[PDB]
Design a protein around this ligand. Sequence first.
Ligand SMILES: Nc1ncnc2c1ncn2[C@H]1O[C@@H](COP(=O)(O)OP(=O)(O)O)[C@H](O)[C@@H]1O
Ligand SMILES: Nc1ncnc2c1ncn2[C@H]1O[C@@H](COP(=O)(O)OP(=O)(O)O)[C@H](O)[C@@H]1O
Lengths: 238, 238, 117, 115
Amino acid sequence: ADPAECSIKVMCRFRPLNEAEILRGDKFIPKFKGEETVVIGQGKPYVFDRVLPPNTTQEQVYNACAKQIVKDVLEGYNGTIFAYGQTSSGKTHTMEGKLHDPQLMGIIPRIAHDIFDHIYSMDENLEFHIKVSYFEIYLDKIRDLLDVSKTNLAVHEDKNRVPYVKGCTERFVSSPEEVMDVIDEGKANRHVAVTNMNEHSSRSHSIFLINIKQENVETEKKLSGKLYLVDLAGSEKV
Amino acid sequence: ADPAECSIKVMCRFRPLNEAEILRGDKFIPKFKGEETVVIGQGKPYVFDRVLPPNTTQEQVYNACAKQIVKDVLEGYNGTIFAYGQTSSGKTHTMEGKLHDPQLMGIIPRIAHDIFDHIYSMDENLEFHIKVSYFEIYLDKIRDLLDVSKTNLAVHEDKNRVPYVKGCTERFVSSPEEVMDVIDEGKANRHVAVTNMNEHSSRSHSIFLINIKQENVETEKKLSGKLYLVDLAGSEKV
Amino acid sequence: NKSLSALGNVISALAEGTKTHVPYRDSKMTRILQDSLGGNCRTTIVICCSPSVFNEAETKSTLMFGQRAKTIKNTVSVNLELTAEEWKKKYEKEKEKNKALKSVIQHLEVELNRWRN
Amino acid sequence: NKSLSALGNVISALAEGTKTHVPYRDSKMTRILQDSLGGNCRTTIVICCSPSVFNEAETKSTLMFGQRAKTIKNTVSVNLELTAEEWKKKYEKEKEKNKALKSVIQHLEVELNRW
Ligand SMILES: Nc1ncnc2c1ncn2[C@H]1O[C@@H](COP(=O)(O)OP(=O)(O)O)[C@H](O)[C@@H]1O
Ligand SMILES: Nc1ncnc2c1ncn2[C@H]1O[C@@H](COP(=O)(O)OP(=O)(O)O)[C@H](O)[C@@H]1O
């Protein structure tokens, strides 16, 4: 066929001043203009795909940042959503949120429900096989969160030269709930060997991987998508 | 896109004057220059890839002639070695030689050793499957040597037009020990119906065929090479 | 942080158009995300920031990663699952058209030249 | 000596560079040693020989047989079965060609309706 160019989208999510900050009487520097511009005091304006101010809820940030990737993924396209920021800025509230709270869950949890909400509605002639993965990377080392005994996982290259974590654990899910369970499990296991999680996360990337494969039993056409939901490490400098 | 040119290499191996010749007081005519030239008495030099004098041992001939083929064929290339020359010239000594004597064995014996010798040190991703067959060609008829039951085997052709003996015996081998059993087995059989053995082979053609097919599980890539170890029959005139 | 280091070198080196020796292999992640960062995939980047003046320097930096990131362009294409058979067959098909077009091309040419000649 | 004959025949022809009715079918052997004598195969030929002057004749011939076969040039090609995702590449670039072809049409077919 003919594949299309597509700029990588970027969302600017700004978080509320928090208790310490409030108390110290800090003032909110960002000035929002429209849905995708942000001004910092008196400097050149910043323009992004969308600029998510502090009052933008978790639903909204899902609907503006991830609702369309689930759709593309279920169709054969590879979607990748990631959080980049400074420690304490907002990445984890974004990506995971209050994992089992309807109001405050984040991207992952939501993509967990969307994928199966979409699927269940499809025609029975469409046969999906969703298999999840959950590893973390610390000081350039990959640790399967679902098998804590695996701690120096390698990245090889598949059939068609595409990088990938070899030997990680792959779970076949069949509901929003079995994916949550995989989240829950890797959330605990992350502790195994960790004295300070706060410090840990602050320096570790948590990488969730929904690997979708669909098959039309009628027409026999088969497609596969790789959904990478990454929660990177603090970007704070030297 | 492309295949690479490169010509047939010819090695000339001279054998040391025999006891019988000895007594008569035969004169030694060959006159060698460097490692590729030779001239008889007062003629023009015949240059070959290499030229092994009478003191050439079976380890040197192999190193000079069949060391590479094994690598080649193990790379996916086709390999073919054959001995040519008048009867009692050295062909069978060179091709087979003292079959189990670790010093006086010839190309064949060594090749079977190297093949597995190599496979062991070879990539852990690719599985092998070596398939040997052993037949003779006397009076244009192809005799299966691992089955004296078959005696008029026929040449057919494969999808991309390459000839090959049809309905011949095919033996799977995963060790040098096994390969030599087939040689051993076929060396015997050839006796079936043979009155005096000297004459017959002196006038027959034995072709050993090793078919190496490997496939990297990791990258799937499947490879294949064909080795044809042939000892021609006496080339003498009249 | 050598992965972010890795990351940042990847982005910038991509943001350029250099897309030649873009340091993918600089880290375990730059490779996992190799597809995500400059290839077959639809990437969204939620850059997170703090509104306080004390975090202003970092806020600035984060913004600029977004800025430069916004100018990377991926070549997205649905992922098709086929045996080698299918791929060889469809390739054969896309070779029948090749031959086909040829004639039509050599058709026009003749006329125009011929027509003209 | 059929076999040796065909082999004789096939060598000298290839020697010359005639390949076209090079008589592979002259025998069952030459058919098998078909791909070996002028096709896809790295091939070595050890011409064993007697040092005695009493056999000067064959040797000399044998040298010449040896001399002939080195001039033959085969075409080496690793026999590596195409990957699914390998063929897929084939199609891919043979689709640009076909795209680049419709564009060699497009312009080429614009003048055609100009006149
Ligand atoms: N009450 C709230 N409502 C909305 N967002 C909030 C609230 N309290 C905190 N946040 C935000 O504060 C941040 C807390 O998580 P954070 O410290 O930023 O995670 P990380 O350590 O991954 O950067 C989240 O990123 C989020 O945007
Ligand atoms: N360098 C050598 N030293 C000792 N014997 C040799 C040597 N080269 C060849 N021969 C051996 O091989 C034999 C030569 O005849 P042969 O192997 O039967 O060849 P073919 O029948 O193929 O001509 C002699 O009988 C002998 O044992």
